[PDB]
Amino acid sequence: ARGPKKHLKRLAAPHHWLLDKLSGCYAPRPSAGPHKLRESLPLIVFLRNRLKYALNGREVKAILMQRHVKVDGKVRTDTTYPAGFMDVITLDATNENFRLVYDVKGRFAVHRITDEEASYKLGKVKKVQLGKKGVPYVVTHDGRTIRYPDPNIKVNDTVKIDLASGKITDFIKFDAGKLVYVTGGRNLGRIGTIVHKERHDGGFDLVHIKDSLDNTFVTRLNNVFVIGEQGKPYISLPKGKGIKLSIAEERDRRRAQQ
């Protein structure tokens, strides 16, 4: 109150960080950045709780202070930078390259990749507009402002980017039969190759999607994210590939491979 807040308690953050209810009363509040707070990995968690490359935020500060890490090709020596969906990380040491995406459980997964894949990324356009002096520009989900794009690009499309410059290499439009990825909801983590959408002029365009196994569901255009066409994606996927197995077949698979 009386202004912003700058703390954050445990039990208040998302469940998808998998922070224990024990270990003190607090958790790290993400600082500002391109990605919303309710969906952001940040680096301390990514390193300490997922990767185990560090035990304490002190160790993490030491790492970022010696500048091992970068993000989108940028160092970002902050403990609590918001690392969101699609977000590529590069550790020159270990020659490691990750790409923040989700699994079927909605959790940020550890998707190791190569450098050629690190050299680009996708962005869901959140708007296109005319800047000052008749300049057209766009804005993605990762806060990036980009100028002089293809006029064929409209809202809710996806844009492949150079990641050294902030320039667009390519783009994918929004149409039936396009490969999707989910960002938010009960159906988060799935991939299902759109069958069709519905308008609902006045709010909340909806869309029906069916996975490879014909399991259908419906979600919102705010949550959806297109990555490619039927079959081929433009990126590397993790295990599971957005299928959302049932718990029965899941434990069956565990018992098969135990």
Add this chain to the structure above:
Amino acid sequence: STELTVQSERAFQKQPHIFNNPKVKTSKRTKRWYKNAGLGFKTPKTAIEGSYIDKKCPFTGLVSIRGKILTGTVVSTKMHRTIVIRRAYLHYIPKYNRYEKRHKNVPVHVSPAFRVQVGDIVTVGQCRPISKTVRFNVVKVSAA
């Protein structure tokens, strides 16, 4: 409605930033600005022809409908460019596993485009705060 000798008040009521050049002589005796608020609602010929102004009208006034689209029936039209409507409904009390009737009297702004009576069913569209109580505006009527 009833066309009310439009320039009755002290101020000159006009559509702002609508300047009809007197130097040019034409048909279209005055420029009248209007729009279509979407959602399939038909801005009437009465609006596009009439001389009334109504800053608060969604068709010719500088407002914008967004949010909710409700329905009611009219119970009081004694005010100037404003009415009240009764939004009946039922409400579940689970202990008894049944309902009870209820209502809300909701004040809504009306444009001179529509002539209305008590009992006329209407639908309304949310606007910004028009006044202390009016957060809505009339968008269609459904009776006679």
Add this chain to the structure above:
RNA sequence: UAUCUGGUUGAUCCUGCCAGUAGUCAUAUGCUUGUCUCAAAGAUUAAGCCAUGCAUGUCUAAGUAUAAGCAAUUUAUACAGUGAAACUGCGAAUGGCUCAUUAAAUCAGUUAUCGUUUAUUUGAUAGUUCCUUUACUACAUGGUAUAACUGUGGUAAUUCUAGAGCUAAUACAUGCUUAAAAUCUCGACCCUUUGGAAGAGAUGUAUUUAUUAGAUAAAAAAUCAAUGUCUUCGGACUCUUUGAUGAUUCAUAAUAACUUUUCGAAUCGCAUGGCCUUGUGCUGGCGAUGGUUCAUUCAAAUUUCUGCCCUAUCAACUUUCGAUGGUAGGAUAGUGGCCUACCAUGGUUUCAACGGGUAACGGGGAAUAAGGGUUCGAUUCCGGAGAGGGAGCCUGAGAAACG
């Protein structure tokens, strides 16, 4: 884990209650108490009072350092290692504690901002500022304080202070330096009729006002007011440019002026490199800091819909002096009776208004349960409110701030 028992009678069967029984992260208490783990804890009555001591301060390679501080660089004679104090910048509005107020108010879930502000981040983003703008100018770069400190003192005392003497900046404070083209205006002069001209000035961004475009379902012809593109001047005519939203006076752009005139780098560290007409010549890297606008993020403020305990031994309430609405204006960051002026007489109510009470902050949830349910919820999370009671206000992005 869908259970009953004793008691009205001389005895009987019922109603009906009393007592009994079980549990309570519901408290207090008596007696007792050897171990391991986990762990609530001045909320209830007095949101009553408070001794004392702590609880928000803070630096790097990278704003300012002659400490008459420490060190020794020895690369250094301007400085250049460390480094108290003080200036500056940020923060101190987060967090933490309590539940007194508060009953459509909070709050929950659910909408909206086409009705608004937003430090910090993150990504983008100023060639246009020499003003008779041909000597008017520092642009290898302009000026003045002032702390800290020296020393003189006041006070009984306070995180009290004055006078006197210096000195710095990302402190204050002005102020220049870069294309070209194109379009407009005026316009000398040649003068023509087809009529043309040299030359001058203006043209960033920001604020304010006004005006214009910001679109379009379909196809052909008749002439003309004037010829327009060029002509084989018959008239070939195309080319013509327009994004988004469900929807705008949207975005954006353009003309005319306005502004007490904003912003457009007089900043700092490390590296010191290339070209030579070898001059302290011209170029040149990786950073930190700072700045306009847009967007984003952190939010904030208002806000739609539905829902809240008990009371009729509260039934009519509001409206004088704002109550419901309209118009215009002021104020606001912004909508709006938020306030003012004028006008109309409206608005709520037996579907319980208004009023009163609460031993009432609301929820998420807790206890107990066959099921339905009843009771509770100050309290480990979210949102509110408050700092002994009230009102007010500077600072700032942000407070009606209370360490």
Add this chain to the structure above:
RNA sequence: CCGGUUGGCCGGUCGGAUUUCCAACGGGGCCUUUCCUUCUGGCUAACCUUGAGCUUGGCGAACCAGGACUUUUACUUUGAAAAAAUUAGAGUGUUCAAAGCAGGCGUAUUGCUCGAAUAUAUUAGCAUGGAAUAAUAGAAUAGGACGUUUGGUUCUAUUUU
């Protein structure tokens, strides 16, 4: 007519599965007088489209675009959303258990790896299928529906001339 779930010999695999099967079970479509909204477009779709046994050419949704329109609800199915923690609950060594969300596996020399689910979460609000139940409206001093027609009145207007 179509095709789905259970079944059922077969087990043609070695107590797991097939396919042709008698039945039931639920879904979709067609015709029975049964519009069960269509205007403009394109995929023309499935196409009389047939080239000799895989070819040169049917009807707009099955793909969208926009349009005129378009009786109202209630109820119900599904879906989303209902912050975490709590609740029930899967797995798992806290030495059991309360707990916790960790852990386990190797040649332990270099390392590999499952995870940290799921369900409910009123009511209101959103989207969707149904269309019984209960209400609502329609054409009766027909200013009623179709509409190839027939004047006409008003409104708007691109392409070109």
Add this chain to the structure above:
RNA sequence: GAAUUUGGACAAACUUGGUCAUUUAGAGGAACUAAAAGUCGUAACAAGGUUUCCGUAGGUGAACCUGCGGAAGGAUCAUU
């Protein structure tokens, strides 16, 4: 560019009354409950010794009496 200053809105706090609400004394009065082997009688329970009861009005030391109308919970389910 300080002291100071006019006017304005916010308006704490005080003074006086007005009202509401909660407790608190109060001579005396009139009830209730309980205790008590008190006094006066015996109104009711049986046809309770005048059958009870209701409403109403009046009266009397007290229960209670009486008048009008009603009821059976009566002491009559009954006289072709």
Add this chain to the structure above:
RNA sequence: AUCCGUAACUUCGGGAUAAGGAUUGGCUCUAAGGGUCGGGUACGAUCAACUUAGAACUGGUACGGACAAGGGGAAUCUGACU
């Protein structure tokens, strides 16, 4: 004099100018409230009054400026009243 506020009790009519309070000048302005005439088979021209409300300005906080002009309340005995 204008505005506000008004108890018990009550024969419901009163009590009640209850009680109790505020304001009141002058000057300059504003607003509202009217009449008579004009219209083929919405107005306009003219005329003239005193009433009410409000806003600035001003004064040695004064203003029903002299005159004029009620003291009130709680209770009792008594007679109803004029």
Add this chain to the structure above:
RNA sequence: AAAAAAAAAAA
């Protein structure tokens, strides 16, 4: 179809 009142309580 004159009259005929009262009997502490406890079990």
